[PDB]
Design a protein around this motif. Sequence first.
Motif, PDB file in Angstrom:
ATOM      1  N   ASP A   1       0.748  -1.283   0.000  1.00 30.28           N
ATOM      2  CA  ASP A   1       0.000   0.000   0.000  1.00 30.28           C
ATOM      3  C   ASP A   1       0.779   1.336   0.000  1.00 30.28           C
ATOM      4  N   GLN A   2       2.112   1.297   0.077  1.00 29.58           N
ATOM      5  CA  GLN A   2       2.893   2.535  -0.082  1.00 29.58           C
ATOM      6  C   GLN A   2       3.044   3.410   1.215  1.00 29.58           C
ATOM      7  N   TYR A   3       2.826   2.843   2.407  1.00 29.38           N
ATOM      8  CA  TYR A   3       3.176   3.561   3.661  1.00 29.38           C
ATOM      9  C   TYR A   3       4.646   3.338   3.996  1.00 29.38           C
ATOM     10  N   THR A   4       5.261   4.226   4.791  1.00 30.93           N
ATOM     11  CA  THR A   4       6.655   4.058   5.198  1.00 30.93           C
ATOM     12  C   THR A   4       6.829   2.878   6.136  1.00 30.93           C
ATOM     13  N   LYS A   5       8.082   2.569   6.433  1.00 25.48           N
ATOM     14  CA  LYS A   5       8.378   1.506   7.396  1.00 25.48           C
ATOM     15  C   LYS A   5       7.979   1.910   8.842  1.00 25.48           C
ATOM     16  N   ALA A   6       8.128   3.192   9.118  1.00 21.52           N
ATOM     17  CA  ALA A   6       7.984   3.669  10.438  1.00 21.52           C
ATOM     18  C   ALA A   6       6.501   3.661  10.644  1.00 21.52           C
ATOM     19  N   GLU A   7       5.745   3.838   9.566  1.00 16.94           N
ATOM     20  CA  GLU A   7       4.280   3.791   9.648  1.00 16.94           C
ATOM     21  C   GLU A   7       3.734   2.402   9.941  1.00 16.94           C
ATOM     22  N   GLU A   8       4.270   1.400   9.278  1.00 18.41           N
ATOM     23  CA  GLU A   8       3.886   0.037   9.532  1.00 18.41           C
ATOM     24  C   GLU A   8       4.068  -0.335  11.013  1.00 18.41           C
ATOM     25  N   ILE A   9       5.228   0.014  11.537  1.00 20.12           N
ATOM     26  CA  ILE A   9       5.562  -0.221  12.948  1.00 20.12           C
ATOM     27  C   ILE A   9       4.609   0.522  13.935  1.00 20.12           C
ATOM     28  N   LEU A  10       4.380   1.828  13.670  1.00 17.35           N
ATOM     29  CA  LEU A  10       3.441   2.645  14.431  1.00 17.35           C
ATOM     30  C   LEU A  10       2.101   1.972  14.436  1.00 17.35           C
ATOM     31  N   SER A  11       1.602   1.599  13.274  1.00 19.95           N
ATOM     32  CA  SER A  11       0.301   0.967  13.218  1.00 19.95           C
ATOM     33  C   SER A  11       0.287  -0.386  13.919  1.00 19.95           C
ATOM     34  N   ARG A  12       1.423  -1.069  13.899  1.00 15.29           N
ATOM     35  CA  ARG A  12       1.459  -2.423  14.471  1.00 15.29           C
ATOM     36  C   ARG A  12       1.298  -2.331  15.984  1.00 15.29           C
ATOM     37  N   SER A  13       1.926  -1.311  16.534  1.00 13.09           N
ATOM     38  CA  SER A  13       1.882  -1.048  17.953  1.00 13.09           C
ATOM     39  C   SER A  13       0.495  -0.540  18.445  1.00 13.09           C
ATOM     40  N   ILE A  14      -0.063   0.447  17.751  1.00 12.47           N
ATOM     41  CA  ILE A  14      -1.472   0.896  17.993  1.00 12.47           C
ATOM     42  C   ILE A  14      -2.492  -0.263  17.998  1.00 12.47           C
ATOM     43  N   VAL A  15      -2.428  -1.098  16.970  1.00  8.94           N
ATOM     44  CA  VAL A  15      -3.357  -2.237  16.834  1.00  8.94           C
ATOM     45  C   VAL A  15      -3.200  -3.108  18.040  1.00  8.94           C
ATOM     46  N   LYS A  16      -1.944  -3.325  18.450  1.00 10.10           N
ATOM     47  CA  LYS A  16      -1.693  -4.167  19.626  1.00 10.10           C
ATOM     48  C   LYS A  16      -2.294  -3.533  20.884  1.00 10.10           C
ATOM     49  N   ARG A  17      -2.066  -2.217  21.045  1.00  9.91           N
ATOM     50  CA  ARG A  17      -2.553  -1.520  22.222  1.00  9.91           C
ATOM     51  C   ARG A  17      -4.085  -1.533  22.238  1.00  9.91           C
TER      52      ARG A  17
END
Length: 527
Positions: A452-468
Amino acid sequence: DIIIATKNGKVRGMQLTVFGGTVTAFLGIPYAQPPLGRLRFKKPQSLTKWSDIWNATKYANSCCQNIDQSFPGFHGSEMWNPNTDLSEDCLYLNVWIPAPKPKNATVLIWIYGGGFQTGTSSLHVYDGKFLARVERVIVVSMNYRVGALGFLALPGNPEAPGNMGLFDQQLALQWVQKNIAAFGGNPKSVTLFGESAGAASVSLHLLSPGSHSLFTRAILQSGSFNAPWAVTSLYEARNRTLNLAKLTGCSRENETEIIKCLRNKDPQEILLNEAFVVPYGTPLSVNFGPTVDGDFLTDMPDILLELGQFKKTQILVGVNKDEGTAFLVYGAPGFSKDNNSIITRKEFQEGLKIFFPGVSEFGKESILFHYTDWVDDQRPENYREALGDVVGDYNFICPALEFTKKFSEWGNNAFFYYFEHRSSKLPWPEWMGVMHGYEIEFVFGLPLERRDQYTKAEEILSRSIVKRWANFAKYGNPQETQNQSTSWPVFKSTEQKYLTLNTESTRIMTKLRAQQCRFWTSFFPKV
Ligand SMILES: *[C@@H]1O[C@H](CO[C@H]2O[C@@H](C)[C@@H](O)[C@@H](O)[C@@H]2O)[C@@H](O[C@@H]2O[C@H](CO)[C@@H](O)[C@H](O)[C@H]2NC(C)=O)[C@H](O)[C@H]1NC(C)=O
Ligand SMILES: *[C@@H]1O[C@H](CO[C@H]2O[C@@H](C)[C@@H](O)[C@@H](O)[C@@H]2O)[C@@H](O[C@@H]2O[C@H](CO)[C@@H](O)[C@H](O)[C@H]2NC(C)=O)[C@H](O)[C@H]1NC(C)=O
Ligand SMILES: *[C@@H]1O[C@H](CO[C@H]2O[C@@H](C)[C@@H](O)[C@@H](O)[C@@H]2O)[C@@H](O)[C@H](O)[C@H]1NC(C)=O
Ligand SMILES: *[C@@H]1O[C@H](CO)[C@@H](O)[C@H](O)[C@H]1NC(C)=O
Ligand SMILES: *[C@@H]1O[C@H](CO)[C@@H](O)[C@H](O)[C@H]1NC(C)=O
Ligand SMILES: *[C@@H]1O[C@H](CO)[C@@H](O)[C@H](O)[C@H]1NC(C)=O
Ligand SMILES: [Cl-]
Ligand SMILES: [Cl-]
Ligand code: NA
């Protein structure tokens, strides 16, 4: 093939490949009698029940609603417009479950925003298959009537009692109570989540006795019922019902007569006149919204909140750093998405006239005085920045913080976030910053999708939010416990700690917008 048998009959889903795995989706399950004809403006009714298999393989009709035509061709606005046919026959919901079928999964239910005037569950940013794949939760979402068809009110009169959209939401939660075990879900572990009018709806369910026991915990993204746009006073709600009767040549003397008439108008005629039931609209107008109906809402909610009459459970509440920017391009002078929108003092003041229709002259000097004390430089973007802050602080940030304070004082754990990441893909210009509505895609996990064209730092940010979010729902505690993350502290009155969500360093701070909300919350309501 996947058929599930529900209290009302069988339904067939649809398998989906997600991240080398599989999710089952049941898109478009009916949850009430379609509210047509004699049922227009009435509380949702129970479902008749069917033999043979209902196919839940595509999104259903979105409810009738006006469309944003301000920027045709523009993804920034158009991404929020319905992507299924409009129809009064729109009372359907969606269920994504993980595969293999889970045993007793925690359930997340999304309630969309849209000012109570717009929105639908099928937006690509509310697609729940990432959550179900990644966190093995079940995600449910529903369509609920919006605008006058949803919130038209003539108090005490069951032809048009008000709050019908909220009863739609409420009846979808019943459906989940009765039905979700058959899909592998735990009716005893349900968390409601919503953004903007959806968040405000989440908070009203925290006050509704009828909802007390259709859910466990709640998440409020940029909204809460104590926001200035969230509840229509009984006064306004009838002025508006009448101006709408009038506007559609339906003025009567018997009020059940007014409604019989309005039931014969065809949906376009109602929609078309909604914007005019108010003499002065703002870009933030909610012409038809929740009311104190004596049914869903038994008293002014400011009072219930103050005096602790609400469901005792944990809450997760948060806001985005530039809440107010989105609205400035829908009517504030000298503002545009196609330029940096440096405005002047004189435009700032006209801006305030747009956002604060009336609002005394002293009311508006006082805003200007609080918000235009430059420190300092000058700084051409001063007045542009200040108007967005005025709009965001008043409409979203301070009402959220005030809600969280008050809720927390009756003894429940409460967590507060401050979302400050601007999506690398955001189509609105840079000066609009971290806009209202643009954390949703992080919460639903869109950046987990690498194609989908998001940055790496974005994938990580989202991964953490979803977890929280998932840890909040299953456990009541939005920690990410594995990757040496910052511990999210409870929000207490007194210290008022909150967690920032950004791509570099997340931090713990205290007392968000302390000076501003003292102005909004203590002084301004007086004027
Ligand atoms: C409560 O409603 C009245 C109704 O006036 C409205 O008539 C509707 C059909 C609609 O088209 C709307 O645009 C129109 O205003 C409001 O009274 C109006 O107030 C302004 C000045 O404040 C006058 O200049 C209008 O023409 C006047 N109309 C009439 C017929 O009296 C009234 O303001 C409103 N109250 C609010 C603000 O809640
Ligand atoms: C940024 O743009 C605004 C918005 O309106 C303009 O959109 C521009 C991109 C331009 O192409 C123009 O066609 C369109 O009107 C500008 O505000 C406008 O300023 C003009 C100056 O004459 C006024 O007459 C307009 O009323 C006003 N627009 C409205 C209706 O709000 C703005 O000046 C521009 N500012 C910059 C470049 O800093
Ligand atoms: C499924 O689990 C049920 C209870 O689990 C929940 O307890 C609640 C009080 C709430 O805090 C949730 O977050 C917990 O997950 C249990 O009583 C049922 O009998 C279980 N049924 C099954 C396994 O099918
Ligand atoms: C439901 O869809 C499936 C598609 O495989 C089909 O087998 C079944 O007949 C359908 N029933 C309809 C079209 O109502
Ligand atoms: C108004 O008309 C309705 C609809 O027929 C009727 O039920 C009601 O009794 C009337 N109200 C009065 C007495 O004004
Ligand atoms: C933990 O961090 C690793 C990278 O070292 C990553 O692969 C994984 O997805 C992370 N887990 C969560 C829940 O953030
Ligand atoms: Cl001046
Ligand atoms: Cl961290
Ligand atoms: Na003052």
